[PDB]
Design a protein around this ligand. Structure first.
Ligand SMILES: N[C@@H](CCC(=O)O)C(=O)O
Ligand SMILES: N[C@@H](CCC(=O)O)C(=O)O
Ligand code: NA
Ligand SMILES: [Zn+2]
Length: 153
């Protein structure tokens, strides 16, 4: 399977709780930089570690964040039923997702759909009063790549 990079995240020793995911929730953080930076930023605002389970970089590199076995902090009301996938950038201002990042996102979500037997994938905005993952995020195109069987519909 694809390379999922494993790095030490301050706070990951405090992972606890439970999660039975039946959905994948797509996010942006309005942030460019390393997963370590994002982890440290979220630890400054009441998270023990990064709220997201995976981070997909502009160059298509994928990092493991919060363990999926642990209680999540990616979406209010969905901490025990979801996988949070974050895409590097600010897609409320950035008009163009690099194709390397888009393809890595589809690869990761297909792999997770396979491992967890998950149907439902959508933007944060589907589940909560937010613009996340941003007005310019190619969300319908990405969901199109994930539902190939729809071409025979
Ligand atoms: N510190 C908790 C979140 C608590 C909260 O958001 O109120 C966590 O990182 O899982
Ligand atoms: N006291 C914890 C709460 C975070 C969640 O859980 C911290 O900020 O490290
Ligand atoms: Na880690
Ligand atoms: Zn979000």
């Amino acid at each position: 399977h694809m390379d999922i990079k494993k790095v030490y995240l301050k706070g990951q020793e405090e992972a606890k709780g439970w999660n039975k995911p039946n959905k994948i929730i797509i996010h942006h953080p309005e942030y460019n930089g390393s997963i370590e930076g994002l982890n440290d930023i979220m630890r400054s605002m009441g998270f023990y570690m990064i709220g997201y389970n995976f981070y997909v970089r502009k160059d298509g590199t994928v990092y493991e964040g919060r363990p999926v076995w642990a209680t999540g902090a990616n979406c209010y009301g969905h901490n025990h039923d979801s996988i949070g996938v974050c895409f590097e950038g600010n897609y409320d201002k950035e008009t163009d997702m690099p194709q390397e990042q888009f393809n890595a996102g589809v690869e990761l979500i297909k792999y997770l759909k396979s491992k967890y037997g998950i149907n439902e994938v959508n933007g944060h905005k589907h589940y909560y009063n937010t613009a996340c993952p941003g007005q310019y995020f190619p969300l319908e195109k990405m969901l199109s790549c994930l539902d190939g069987q729809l071409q025979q519909e």
